[PDB]
Amino acid sequence: MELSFGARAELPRIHPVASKLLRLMQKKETNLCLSADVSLARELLQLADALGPSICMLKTHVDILNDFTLDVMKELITLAKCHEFLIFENRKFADIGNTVKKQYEGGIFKIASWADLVNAHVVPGSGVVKGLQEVGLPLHRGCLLIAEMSSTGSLATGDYTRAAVRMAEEHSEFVVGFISGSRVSMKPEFLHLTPGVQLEAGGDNLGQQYNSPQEVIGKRGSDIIIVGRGIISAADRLEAAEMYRKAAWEAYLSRLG
Amino acid sequence: MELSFGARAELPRIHPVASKLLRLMQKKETNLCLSADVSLARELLQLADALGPSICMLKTHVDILNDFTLDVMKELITLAKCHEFLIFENRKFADIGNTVKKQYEGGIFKIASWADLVNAHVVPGSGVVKGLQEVGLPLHRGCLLIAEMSSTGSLATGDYTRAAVRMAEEHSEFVVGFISGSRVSMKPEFLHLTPGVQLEAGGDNLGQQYNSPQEVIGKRGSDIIIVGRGIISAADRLEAAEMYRKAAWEAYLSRLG
Ligand SMILES: O=c1[nH]c(=O)n([C@@H]2O[C@H](COP(=O)(O)O)[C@@H](O)[C@H]2O)cc1F
Numbered sequence: 001m002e003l004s005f006g007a008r009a010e011l012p013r014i015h016p017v018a019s020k021l022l023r024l025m026q027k028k029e030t031n032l033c034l035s036a037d038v039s040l041a042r043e044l045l046q047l048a049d050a051l052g053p054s055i056c057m058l059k060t061h062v063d064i065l066n067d068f069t070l071d072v073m074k075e076l077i078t079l080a081k082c083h084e085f086l087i088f089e090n091r092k093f094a095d096i097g098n099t100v101k102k103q104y105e106g107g108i109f110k111i112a113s114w115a116d117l118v119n120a121h122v123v124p125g126s127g128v129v130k131g132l133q134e135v136g137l138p139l140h141r142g143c144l145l146i147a148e149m150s151s152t153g154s155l156a157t158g159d160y161t162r163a164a165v166r167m168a169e170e171h172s173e174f175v176v177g178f179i180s181g182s183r184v185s186m187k188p189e190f191l192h193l194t195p196g197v198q199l200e201a202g203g204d205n206l207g208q209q210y211n212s213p214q215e216v217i218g219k220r221g222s223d224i225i226i227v228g229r230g231i232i233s234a235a236d237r238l239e240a241a242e243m244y245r246k247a248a249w250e251a252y253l254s255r256l257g
Numbered sequence: 258m259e260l261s262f263g264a265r266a267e268l269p270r271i272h273p274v275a276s277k278l279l280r281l282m283q284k285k286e287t288n289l290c291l292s293a294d295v296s297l298a299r300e301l302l303q304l305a306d307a308l309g310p311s312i313c314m315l316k317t318h319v320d321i322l323n324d325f326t327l328d329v330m331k332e333l334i335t336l337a338k339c340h341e342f343l344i345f346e347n348r349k350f351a352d353i354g355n356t357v358k359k360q361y362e363g364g365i366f367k368i369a370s371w372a373d374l375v376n377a378h379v380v381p382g383s384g385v386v387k388g389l390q391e392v393g394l395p396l397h398r399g400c401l402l403i404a405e406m407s408s409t410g411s412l413a414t415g416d417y418t419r420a421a422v423r424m425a426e427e428h429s430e431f432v433v434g435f436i437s438g439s440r441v442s443m444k445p446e447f448l449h450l451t452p453g454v455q456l457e458a459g460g461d462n463l464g465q466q467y468n469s470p471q472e473v474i475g476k477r478g479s480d481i482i483i484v485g486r487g488i489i490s491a492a493d494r495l496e497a498a499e500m501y502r503k504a505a506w507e508a509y510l511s512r513l514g
C-alpha cells in the first residue's frame with residue numbers, strides 16, 4: 001500500500017521537483033524542513049550550511065531578511081546543492097493570477113529564480129495556481145497549496161481543504177503537494193508538509209499551535225515536518241535539527257512498517 | 258440611515274486612518290483607489306503625482322517594483338501628503354501572527370514604515386490580525402481584511418466572509434475595513450474597498466472578473482473602487498482615472514440620495 005519516499009520518487013505522475021525531494025529524503029534519512037526564520041543573511045547561511053545535512057528542505061521568508069540580496073540566495077543555492085536540500089519560499093501567494101505571476105518572477109526578490117518550491121493559498125481560486133504556473137512551469141519549479149494551517153482559528157478546514165486538494169490534483173504539472181496538518185490527498189505523488197511542530201506541547205502567543213513529529217508524521221500521515229523556533233531558538237541548532245530529524249524519520253518508518 | 262463619507266469620518270468608533278481617508282474622500286470627491294501595478298518606480302511616482310488629485314488611495318504591490326527602495330517610498334509619501342491620498346500596500350498577509358509581524362515591520366520593504374493601510378487574509382485565524390496589530394497599532398496604521406475576492410473560484414464566500422467580518426468587528430482598533438465585492442459589514446465605521454472593477458464587462462485570462470463602478474458602489478454598496486488595468490493600461494491614465502472617479506463618486510451619491 002504505502003510506499004517509501006524512494007518509491008514515491010518514481011511514481012508515474014510524480015513531479016520532477018517532488019521526485020528530487022523524495023530521493024534526497026530517502027538518501028539522507030530526513031523529512032525535516034528547517035524554517036529558517038531569521039533576519040540576518042549570515043545566520044541564514046550559517047544555519048543552512050550546518051543543518052544542511054540534516055534537512056530535506058530549507059524554508060525561507062525572504063521578506064524578513066533585513067539584508068536580502070540575490071547574492072545571498074546564490075550562496076544559499078550553493079549550500080542547497082552541496083548538502084542536497086530544496087529551497088522553499090513560504091510566500092503564500094494569495095492574489096489573482098495576474099498579480100501573483102509578477103510577484104513570483106519579479107520585483108527585488110526574483111523568487112522564481114532561486115526557490116525550488118513556493119506555496120499559495122487557495123482562497124483566490126485556481127487562477128492563483130494558473131498565474132504562478134506561467135512562471136514556474138518554464139522554470140521547472142513546484143508549488144505547494146495551503147490546505148490546512150496550524151494556527152488557532154484557521155479557516156482552512158472542511159470544504160476549503162477539499163478545494164485545495166482538488167485544485168492540487170487538477171494542477172499536478174506544477175502543484176506537488178500541500179501545507180497541511182495531516183495527509184489530505186490520497187494520491188501518493190503529493191507531498192504533505194506540516195508546520196506547527198515542536199517536540200513539547202504548546203503554542204505561541206499569536207495563535208501558533210504545536211504538535212509533535214510523531215503525531216504529525218506518525219498519526220496524521222504527513223510527510224515532512226516544518227520546524228522553526230523549535231530549532232532556531234535552541235542553543236545548539238544542529239542538535240535540535242537532529243532531534244527533529246530523527247523524530248520525523250522514525251515516525252515515518254514506523255508508519256511504513 | 259446611510260451617512261456621507263464626511264459624516265462617517267466622525268463616527269464615534271471610527272479609526273483614525275479611516276477618518277482621515279473618509280475626510281479626504283469627501284473633500285476631493287473621490288472614492289477611487291488606484292492600483293498602481295507597475296514595475297518601475299518612475300512610473301509609480303509619475304502616476305501618483307498625476308493621478309493623486311483624483312484618488313483617495315494608491316494601492317501598491319511593492320514586491321513587483323523592480324527598483325524598490327525605501328527612498329522611492331519616501332517620494333511616494335511626499336506625493337500622498339501633497340495630493341492627499343493614503344498608501345495601501347496590498348500585501349495580503351496570510352501567515353501566523355508571529356510571522357506576519359516580522360513581514361510587516363521588517364525585511365527590505367519595511368512596509369509598516371510607509372503604508373497607511375495593509376491587508377490580510379483571514380484564513381489563518383485572528384492571530385494574523387493580532388500579529389499585525391503589534392506593529393501597526395503603535396505606528397497608528399490600519400488594516401483591511403479580505404472578506405471576498407474578485408476572482409473566479411474564490412473561496413472567500415459564505416461562512417468565510419462572515420468570519421472575516423467578525424474578525425474585523427472584533428479588532429476595530431486596527432481593522433478599518435475590508436476588501437470585498439459588496440458591503441459585508443453593517444457597521445458604517447468600516448470601509449469597503451472593491452477590486453475587480455472596470456467600466457466594460459469582462460475579465461482577464463487568469464481569473465479576474467470585472468464589475469462596473471455603478472454595480473459595485475451603487476448596487477452592491479461598497480465604498481471605494483480599486484482599479485488597476487482599467488486605468489494603467491489606458492493611454493491617458495489621468496483621464497481614465499477621472500472617468501473611474503466620476504463613476505464611483507456618482508454611484509455613491511446616488512445611493513446616498
Ligand atoms: O499553517 C502554517 N503554519 C506555519 O507556522 N507556517 C510557517 O511555518 C513556520 C512555523 O514556525 P515555528 O517557529 O516552528 O512556529 C513559520 O515560518 C510560519 O510562517 C506556515 C503555514 F502555512
Ligand SMILES: O=c1[nH]c(=O)n([C@@H]2O[C@H](COP(=O)(O)O)[C@@H](O)[C@H]2O)cc1F
Pocket residue numbers: 095096099292294318347403405406407408436452453454465483484485486487
Ligand atoms: O480580490 C482581490 N482582487 C484583486 O484584483 N486584488 C488586486 O486588485 C488589483 C486589481 O487590478 P486590475 O488590474 O484592476 O484587475 C490587483 O493589484 C489585484 O492584485 C486584490 C484582491 F484582494
